[PDB]
Design a binder for this molecule. Structure first.
Ligand SMILES: CCCC(=O)N[C@@H](CCO)C(=O)O
Length: 275
């Protein structure tokens, strides 16, 4: 059973899905124009059966309302504020965080806001300073849509297919079509302007374990760039790459992805801790 409920937050009404796992909590943060529903394989599978998986919808996304104040909410740092508020309301201070793409950038901005975070895993996310956006991401037509407010029908399909990978289904179009397009435009502009904390410096200086897991056929992220990013505490000492997966290995290759995620959660929550 996945438990669905809604929170009244300062950002708006936020939808939250939780598994019934008895173990340590995992906050999973979805990507641009997606929804926590995308994490069905984890919510409903072995990960969610053991651990308390929490998969909200960002303001403007999924089953959440649009933001009360788009100018406050629709940015990497604004979303980080919102997720921190969600975790406050849920009464959970020590989650492991998994962030997918935009969600990974949000997770990076959460490091300063959510001090008892036990670890952060980022997938589809190159930590970049504002001037490095061109280096960390692959230029292309779908990448261009990340910051585009108005999507045509073909835009919705192209973006959904490229972000979610195989297998595709119609429900994904519904998720992407719902997204408040203002959120795309404002977030991307603010990202390029560096309105939040410099993510390159944040990950270099962060002491908590940071895990990096990507699909080899990533269409958005430059894996060469990612493999050169300095992390304060890179989990297992390297960035990880999964064959036969692209931007969304958690759904494209769930068993292989789950091996990494489960091991990371175990390492961050059930190993003896020494400074
Ligand atoms: C570029 C800002 C972060 C972002 O929107 N990432 C996208 C991938 C690129 O289209 C995502 O969240 O999937």
């Amino acid at each position: 059973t996945i438990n669905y409920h809604e929170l009244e937050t300062s950002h708006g009404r936020i939808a939250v899905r939780e598994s019934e796992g008895e173990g340590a909590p995992l906050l999973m943060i979805h990507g641009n124009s997606s929804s926590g529903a995308i994490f069905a394989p984890q919510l409903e599978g072995e990960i969610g059966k053991k651990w308390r998986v929490i998969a909200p919808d960002l303001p403007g996304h999924g089953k959440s309302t649009d933001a009360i104040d788009p100018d406050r909410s629709y940015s990497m740092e604004g979303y980080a504020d919102a997720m921190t508020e969600v975790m406050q309301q849920l009464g959970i201070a020590d989650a492991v965080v998994f962030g997918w793409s935009l969600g990974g950038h949000i997770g990076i901005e959460m490091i300063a806001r959510y001090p008892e975070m036990r670890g952060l895993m980022i997938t589809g996310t190159p930590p970049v300073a504002r001037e490095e956006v061109g280096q960390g991401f692959k230029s292309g037509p779908d990448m261009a849509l990340a910051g585009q407010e108005i999507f045509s029908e073909r835009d919705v399909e192209s973006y959904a297919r490229s972000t979610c990978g195989e297998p595709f289904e119609a429900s994904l179009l519904d998720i992407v079509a719902r997204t408040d397009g203002r959120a795309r435009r404002i977030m991307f502009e603010k990202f390029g302007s560096g309105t939040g904390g410099n993510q390159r410096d944040i990950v270099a200086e962060a002491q908590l374990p940071i895990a990096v897991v990507n699909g080899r056929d990533e269409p958005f992220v430059e894996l060469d760039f990612v493999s050169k990013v300095k992390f304060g505490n890179l989990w297992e000492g390297k960035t990880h790459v999964i064959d036969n997966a692209g931007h969304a290995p958690f759904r494209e290759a769930p068993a292989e992805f789950d091996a990494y995620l489960a091991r990371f959660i175990r390492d961050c929550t059930q190993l003896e801790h020494h400074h």
